[PDB]
């Protein structure tokens, strides 16, 4: 049965041979292809990619950042244009404003500072999906969205950026990401890993065991500078996935801290340097 | 290079041999497989299935029907649960309340009746796509979301059930659609046709050609009573597509009307009654 990291490998591949040239924002070529798909499976096994090494310290970090609902960046521990749409001061205080977990806990409630009290205030996508999948499991309506912050700014009703599902059957939670654009070379392997422990900390606190994770892209993108590493990486032949260990039982989805966690098996290839 | 309903077909074929059985709420079980993805080309050929006839001008007018933003059930011609959050006396003189295509061009105006002038209000996400089109080809957020009708009196905030993205490269229209539930026998082959149609509505206006279908699923399932008909339907041989014809030159898509449509070459196998 095929090791999942060829897939992604699969798509770098698939790229570099027939993806054009498009243009980002930022200026930079890209070589494109719309629309791919991967499947990982989470069956005691955690898919942190084995031919570079994943910083998952700081994966597990930013999430937990995210879960708090936290819009200050001094609280983003040591593991763009979006920042002039703020005030000089409470930007320079680490104040964000209403963006990355601010809507996954809010969603939708008005943005006082950064140190106001939000509680009650505006969706709370997350403890939705978590109290969906013990109200109804079969519901195919647990669903997350996350916006790009820039975008909050530029107009009414922005499209999110990524749309995460999650599905329960046979005692298995599984989760499907749908992102409208991913960089192959450095989002991707960050956000497969942030989304799979996303849905081991939700199965833990549901009594479920993590099943698959499905990762869906739009506009799946390689830099014009990340094209000879990638081409480098591609040579190197992935290593079984590690395992990821939950080291107490946690009831509730804000009690996780980051020494709750332990990765094991973990054998990948050196750190591969990306540059953005 | 093979067939692309062949996808279609596989993926008929791996739910009844690997998909669980999963209870909808309708009562009615299904076989379930959670993530899914196929690829239709739209370069000169029109992905309407051929394993079985497709009722292409209902695809039609309906689709002209949410292009025109109509919640009047009377407006929508010959070719469940929302109804009971309306009132007696409005619901019987054909009036839906704020659902399909009244999203596609207002989403986010308050709604009164079925026969007020929303001109201007809400966002008219179906103009934003073409808008966007033709001002940033390159964007990754030329996105579209439909809502089922039935979520929306239930919650806060509630999910789509449908993201439409476009993309745009070489002066190709590319369209991928997420939906979050697809029903294999009855729904998806019509989705195919509708959003195929819809892209190359756009394609037209914005002079670019149509470039590739992506349909993408959640929970990707079959009702059981659905079985037998579909185990026979994958025992025929997908023909060539069809090509779908626009038989006058239009700029806006209000414009559209069914007689500017015209398929040739369709050569399905029979019609199969799936039984709602």
New interface residues.
């Given amino acids: 049965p095929p090791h999942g990291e060829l897939q992604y490998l699969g798509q770098i591949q698939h790229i570099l041979r027939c993806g054009?040239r498009?243009?980002?924002?930022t200026g930079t070529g890209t070589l494109?292809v719309?629309?791919?798909?991967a499947?990982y499976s989470l069956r005691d096994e955690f898919p942190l990619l084995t031919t570079k090494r994943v910083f998952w310290k700081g994966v597990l970090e930013e999430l937990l950042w995210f879960i708090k609902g936290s819009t200050n960046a001094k609280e983003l521990s040591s593991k763009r244009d979006f920042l002039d749409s703020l005030g000089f001061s409470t930007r320079e205080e680490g104040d964000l404003g209403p963006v990355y977990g601010f809507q996954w806990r809010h969603?939708?409630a008005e943005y006082r500072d950064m140190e106001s009290d939000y509680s009650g205030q505006g969706?709370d996508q997350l403890q939705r999906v978590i109290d969906t999948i013990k109200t109804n499991p079969?519901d195919?309506?647990i669903?997350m969205?996350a916006w790009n912050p820039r975008?909050l700014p530029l107009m009414?009703?922005?499209?999110?950026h990524a749309?995460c599902?999650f599905?329960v059957?046979?005692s298995e939670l599984?989760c499907?990401l749908?992102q409208?654009?991913g960089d192959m070379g450095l989002g991707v392997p960050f956000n497969i890993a942030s989304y799979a422990l996303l849905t081991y900390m939700i199965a833990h606190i549901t009594g479920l065991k993590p099943?698959?994770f499905?990762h869906?892209l739009?506009?799946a993108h390689i830099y014009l500078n990340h094209i000879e590493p990638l081409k480098i990486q591609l040579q190197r032949e992935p290593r079984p996935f590690p395992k990821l260990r939950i080291l107490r039982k946690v009831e509730k989805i804000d009690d996780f801290k980051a020494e709750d966690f332990q990765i094991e098996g973990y054998n990948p290839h050196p750190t591969i340097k990306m540059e953005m």
Same sequence: chains 1, 2.
């Avoid at 498009?22 to 924002?25: L, Q, V």
């Avoid at 719309?34 to 798909?37: A, C, K």
């Avoid at 009414?156 to 999110?160: E, I, R, Y």
């Fill in positions: 054009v498009k243009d980002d924002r494109s719309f629309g791919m798909q499947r969603f939708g969706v079969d195919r309506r669903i969205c975008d009414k009703l922005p499209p999110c749309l599902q599905y059957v046979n599984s499907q749908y409208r654009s099943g698959d499905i869906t739009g506009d």
